[PDB]
Amino acid sequence: LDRAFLDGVGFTPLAEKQQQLQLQLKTNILTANLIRSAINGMNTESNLEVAIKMMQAAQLHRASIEIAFPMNVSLSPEIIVQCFIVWMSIPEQLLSDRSNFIIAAVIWAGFSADDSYADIMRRSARASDRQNYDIIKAALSSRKFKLPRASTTLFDENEPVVRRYQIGRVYAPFPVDRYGSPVYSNCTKVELASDYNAEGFTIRKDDFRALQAVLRIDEDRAADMFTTLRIMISSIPAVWYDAEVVHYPHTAVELEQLAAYGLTGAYPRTNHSVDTIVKTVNNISATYSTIAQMLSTIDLDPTRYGTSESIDKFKIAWENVESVLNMEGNDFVKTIMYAYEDNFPKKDFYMM
Amino acid sequence: FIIAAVIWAGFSADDSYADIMRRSARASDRQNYDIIKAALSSRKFKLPRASTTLFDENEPVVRRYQIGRVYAPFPVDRYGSPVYSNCTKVELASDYNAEGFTIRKDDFRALQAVLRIDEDRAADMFTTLRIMISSIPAVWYDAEVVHYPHT
Amino acid sequence: MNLEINNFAPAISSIGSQLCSLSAQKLLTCRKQYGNGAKSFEEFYAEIGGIIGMMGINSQTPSGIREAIYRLYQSAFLFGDIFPESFGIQNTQNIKPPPGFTAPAKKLEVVLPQGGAFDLIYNNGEIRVTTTRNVQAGDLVCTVTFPIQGSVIATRNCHVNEIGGQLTTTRPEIIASVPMPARTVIVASFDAIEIGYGEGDDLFAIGIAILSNRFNGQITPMSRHNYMTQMFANLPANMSERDSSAVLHFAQAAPVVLGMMERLTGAPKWVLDY
Amino acid sequence: MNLEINNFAPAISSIGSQLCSLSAQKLLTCRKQYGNGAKSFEEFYAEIGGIIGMMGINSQTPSGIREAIYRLYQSAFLFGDIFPESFGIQNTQNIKPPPGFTAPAKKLEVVLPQGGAFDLIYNNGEIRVTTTRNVQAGDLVCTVTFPIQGSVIATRNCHVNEIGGQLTTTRPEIIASVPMPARTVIVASFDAIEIGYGEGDDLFAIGIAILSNRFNGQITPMSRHNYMTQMFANLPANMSERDSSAVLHFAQAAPVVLGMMERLTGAPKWVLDY
Amino acid sequence: MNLEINNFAPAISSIGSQLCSLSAQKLLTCRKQYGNGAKSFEEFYAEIGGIIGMMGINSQTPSGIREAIYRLYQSAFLFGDIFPESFGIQNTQNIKPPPGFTAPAKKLEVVLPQGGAFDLIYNNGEIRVTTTRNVQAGDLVCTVTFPIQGSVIATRNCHVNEIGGQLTTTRPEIIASVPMPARTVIVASFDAIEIGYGEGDDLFAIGIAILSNRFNGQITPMSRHNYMTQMFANLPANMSERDSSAVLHFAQAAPVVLGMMERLTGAPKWVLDY
Amino acid sequence: MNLEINNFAPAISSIGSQLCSLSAQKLLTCRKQYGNGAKSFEEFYAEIGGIIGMMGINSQTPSGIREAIYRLYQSAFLFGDIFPESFGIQNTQNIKPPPGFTAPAKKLEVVLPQGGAFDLIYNNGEIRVTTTRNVQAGDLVCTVTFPIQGSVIATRNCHVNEIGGQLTTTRPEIIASVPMPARTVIVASFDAIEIGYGEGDDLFAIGIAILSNRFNGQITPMSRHNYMTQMFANLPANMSERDSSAVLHFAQAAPVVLGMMERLTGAPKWVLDY
């Protein structure tokens, strides 16, 4: 539903971001700076896919984003700058615990006096990532180091429409409040005692201030930034918000794509109305009701051939269901069912 | 044992492929396989192992000779569920790095998904096994391998 | 035990008995095809012993049947006269007849006339009383409070109504027929059938503990005979024999099925063929 | 109770403790993710709480865990010569230490040496004997057999080897300090911790009966204190203090987990944090 | 105190206990991630510690939580019957079992029969009686009205129904075994557990005053033991022991959580692990 | 045992307790994730024992945490009262409250009023004194010098200021209520909680020698009760109860963590939930 009804993305083109960062940077043009040279090799390709996954992570608290890091043991200027961008631009409620911990450790390895990325990864356990992340965030929110961590809040607003189901509240896929000011879990100020050093890579203290300055979302798009959230809140049933995750690749994005998405301040955008989405949901419910009624009037028998039935009898039982799924008005459920048979088989669907 | 060693070479923190292969001296093949299998079904790592059970369903027919039970070559159960010796789902909290060859941890879930057996497949397997079990003489099930190439 | 039976007990019993019979039939069906491999029979039953098509049951595992039995028993026999809307009850009048009783009447229940005239001792199937004082022919000696049907054997120094050796009324009364002085003794043996089903007594003992560990304030472990005597004593007066039979059938089937789902042996005929 | 603990006990006990800890972790995890609805808590637990994947447990239902506990318990503590080769027992070279004991020493076991010169009575925290005749100073009057560890408080007309308030030995002995007349009373109270744990005693009562109904001729239901004293008395002499701790941890973890799987309440910290 | 418990208390106590458990978990989560000492810990909690999502509660401040427990406690204990549907519970019987009681029974209530044959002295964990006249063996001397469970230690000149050191009955009845004349004394000590929870005793003291300031006409400050005894004695007669635990958990959990919200210390296991 | 408490002790304890709690959490996680193999749990811990995220301290290794514990204990409690600049000891204006005390009061400390008119003997939880001569009713006979709070039971010939069973003051004073002749015995039993924590007593026993072998001239092995009493008595008078709580927590948390790093068992809850 998110992929079908979100056909656009409201980002800003990268050239203006590069010019803004060049204006904010207090460095000579001849001198080479790695934070500047790392955003010149980035592109806003696939911002739409990242926007769809952001919306899914906002709606479902179990489908938190898992980041795929190209690095294994070593680091790189691109990795460091992208981790900083993710830290300062992507709220933590939309990221998984491991995704938070990896970027937190990358940030901490440069500000730590003796710790290194390889040691932090080897000593830490994937089981306790949330604790270690909390400790690192507390360390980075102390009075010696202060890095603002992006956050988000819940929203209740909705456009009026006729629907048979109750709705809930979701997080926002962007880091601002209703007023339009950026949201941070901790302080909004940046000050550091020393520089950033990890391996030979180094960043000046004013570079982070410039990066914070350039990562401010445009106030003008606020009206367009919330209509999509309104129509997404007002048209999705609330009882689906506790659903699990069945297809892993739907929640996986690589680091460069997420960094490019967060740098340009992209947000999902749509051109459809509220009633089309609720009509689609009503169609899905109608298909389920039709199949349930057919099963209740034909197949509902407890005396014989239940759990003990051999796998050979499944051909007869399934024929009626796949005949029902082939009539008009059931194409959405049929397509979703046939596309992902590997993850959700026919037997579990039949039992449900 | 060799399959288990090749798999465990990339998940153990310290032992390499040669170090695991060296374990042949202070143990047996069965015991070393048991050790590595127990290491692959721990809290840190969970790799499902294909298993099978004895099969005894035959369709009656008049015959002169004796009948016996045979294992099912396929790893699916009579009711279509997969049969695994240790765990039903792959959940490993590390990456396979062995000798500079690396595979992300998320590829194993996809590999498990693509190896799943559908319903009509299992129906056909059991249809063939049921007719094969009820007609082959069972007196020769205790035979000793003669032409090795056949194994 | 303390327990209150509401006016809609037959409706609840007609669903509970059907659920018990379904579970027992499924148990035998799964018992017939057990692979006899590395898995035990308990795991096999826990994996494939559930019912999937009955309205009222919310799980496909045996625990669902257990929880449904608990709800039905609590609604039908315990203090809370709660009508279970979750199971579908459409007609409270339609009630399939239950199988006839099979329990032999060994310890027959009788009450003395209250004149303090006789002494009561029991035996395998007969009662026999001794006269404390002189008694004249043609007066009451004993009467049974637990209804009984069957034949009569070895009637000495007493009279009971009988046609061809068969008892006439379901509550026979014993009256002396001869003037009998000097502390004589009379006997009365019955080859009859009391209330309940004799078969499956081992499962009842293990299931009554299971359902008394839950309703410990209302139910206590005891023998089947005492349980049925109290259950019959608690029945309402405005109750026909067609309905009380269903109530008692469910009252005995619930502990038997609860104990059968633990010890996965067979099931009695009166439970299977309901 | 008759039982013979073998040399292979620590290997079985490690697996048993690991299985019990996994069961407790799954129980608490499923207890936090239960939303009130149509299904009761027991149905919810039956469907997902049972699934645990280790070598030798072949089931996604609590029945598999119950059978695994039964088999491991019979292999470790029962008389039959049984070993389960199917579990992860081959790689038990190193054993994680079990948690330390926390059971208060309320009834501590002592033995009067000889001569019937002293009469023994017990109290909540203290012991006391009456001398029936004259006694010399500095001789043994009582000595403990069940090891204890902790501080000593309120000692009168006696002496124990303690420095700084802490007992130096795990088996303290009490000796009179001054020649005392007949009818004198010597007392000794201890704020110590005996073998075994304290939490989970409600689950122990319903688990010991569960595992006594199976091994009906080998185990008799009784309190935790007598159970642990007999387990300690049946330990072989040639055993380290590290392996005996694991054996005695499993010997109590099995009944409490068996009882916990019946009443779906919480779990003790010592069972869970193994 | 004066109060009556409605017949639908467990369905409200379940919601109250769940709310208290979520509050405690949120408090501990905030405690762990508090890393900057510049801001007072009270300020940090008051900033984000009140955001909890549940049916019925619609507040993002600790004040809303306090009013929620106030309203639940009032509905459940002070007033008469109120239907559970008002708080939006979906199903009445689907209540998660509460953790078992872990409170030590140091003081043990007993009621002597009429006639004043014996005198009652309570010690730390046992009871002594002194017989003022001649008494024959085989008659009751004491009976326990507060339910108790656990082992028995150091019994002298008395008999109690028990096997293996474990008390067979929850309410024991102490009887004499041999006739004892001329002003004797007999004792009966128990290593048992009562009906409350032991941990969080200070938090209870802080919160009982807080919730007695509001319902001043019904609730007065006192000790935890007396509070629990009166709450148990004020329960309705027609209530199973499985459902009494649910209300007894919330009755003690509400004061503890109310006190804990003031002094931002840790939470007891029986509150958080629900 | 001589030790000097500086006026910056709470600031030091604020970091010491955090270090101890973080070390304990890491051990429990490693213990759960440890897979039995050729490497021992002790060698496995040395590699991944070190904590992360604490600047100004050496803790990348277990030995580093041990050395940090040594330095912090020396700076906070020993005669070397020098505040380390490794951490911002000068500030630390706002701290986190520590968990409430849980240690039961079995040997409560008292002081006789003046000269010696009584004969005092301790008990499991009570104290009894016998008057040598006649004493009037309404005068102080005993006073506790160690703070205590809880309930009061078995009040015989005395009186304590308490309402509803709960003691009004932290230091109750015992006063006779009836004119009593000589040899009269007054008692007072308290179901209360003293200062300290009752869990991890063995861990303290092993850990105290660890830092006694380092600070030979200042610290000697002793019981937990005596150590806590001395530590409380050596605190300065002009200190708040909330401020002294952190010092009292760390004074016991350091030895138990030191012993925990040696015996790789579990850690007590109060150390973890700081």
Automatic annotation (TrEMBL), chain A:
Superkingdom is Viruses
Q: What is this protein called?
A: VP3
Species name: Scylla serrata reovirus SZ-2007
> Which stretch of the full sequence is covered here?
303 to 654 of 854
Automatic annotation (TrEMBL), chains C, D, E, F:
Source domain of life = Viruses
* Name of the protein this chain belongs to: VP12
